[PDB]
Design a protein around this ligand. Structure first.
Ligand SMILES: [Cl-]
Ligand SMILES: [Zn+2]
Length: 257
């Protein structure tokens, strides 16, 4: 029942998901002057060489690329994390125009879109068990801003026409998510939550300081997706981002100065 409409959007989610008003909700605004640089925080370790993509799906609020998470070398570790996290999927959030769309903000600045690479902690055996624990998931977030085209994104954007409506899926093998990473792995990190229902507080967030550049045409293809199923009345898929939530009693740390 939840969505991004006026009557079922993020302001309403707390009615079915009371955790929406909890102590560790995401996304948040990152205040770059108050983020505390921790020089002990280690480098991220992103090993995607063996990442095995499967399919891409329009799920009615976004599109999602799924991975074979039995590949045990397809791993996020290091940085702020204990143990190993397996890549399961990635997806984006975007706006009705270039001037908004990201979920995290930086000094209140909104980016055109935000990529989320979602990984689960192998110590919990599978994703469903993981989301019930405070250290169950690690999500790597990457801002997109408009400029030069990102070559590694092109296979994703070109396939969207074939999954315009809810439920539509397409084989999506041999996609390398390394083509979506910026040069720098400098990041901010904090404990938070899923940003769609069920909004479980099970995520170590790792948000990269450096945005990737994508072309105007590239992000505009995102907005040609539709929330609706085929036959139903066209509802373009835009503004599928949850806004900043109260920081409450948490500290955002930075891996850099
Ligand atoms: Cl394009
Ligand atoms: Zn997300």
């Amino acid at each position: 029942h939840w969505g991004f409409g006026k009557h079922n959007g993020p302001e309403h989610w707390h009615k079915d998901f009371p955790i929406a008003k909890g102590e560790r909700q995401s996304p948040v605004d990152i205040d770059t002057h108050t983020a505390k640089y921790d020089p002990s925080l280690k480098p991220l370790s992103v090993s995607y060489d063996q990442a095995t993509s499967l399919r891409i799906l329009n799920n009615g609020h976004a599109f999602q690329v799924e991975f074979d998470d039995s590949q045990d070398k397809a791993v996020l570790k290091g940085g702020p994390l204990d143990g190993t996290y397996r890549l399961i999927q990635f997806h984006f959030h975007w706006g009705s125009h270039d001037g908004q769309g990201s979920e995290h903000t930086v000094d209140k600045k909104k980016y055109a879109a935000e990529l989320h690479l979602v990984h689960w902690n192998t110590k919990y055996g599978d994703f469903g068990k993981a989301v019930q624990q405070p250290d169950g998931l690690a999500v790597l977030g990457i801002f997109l801003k408009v400029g030069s085209a990102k070559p590694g994104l092109q296979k994703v954007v070109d396939v969207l026409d074939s999954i315009k409506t809810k439920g539509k899926s397409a084989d999506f093998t041999n996609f390398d998510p390394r083509g979506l990473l910026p040069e720098s792995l400098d990041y901010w990190t904090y404990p938070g939550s899923l940003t769609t229902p069920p909004l479980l507080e099970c995520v170590t967030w790792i948000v990269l300081k450096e945005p990737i550049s994508v072309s105007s045409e590239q992000v505009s293809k995102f907005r040609k997706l539709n929330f609706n199923g085929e036959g139903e009345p066209e509802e373009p898929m835009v503004d599928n981002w949850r806004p900043a939530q109260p920081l409450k009693n948490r500290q955002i740390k930075a891996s850099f100065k």
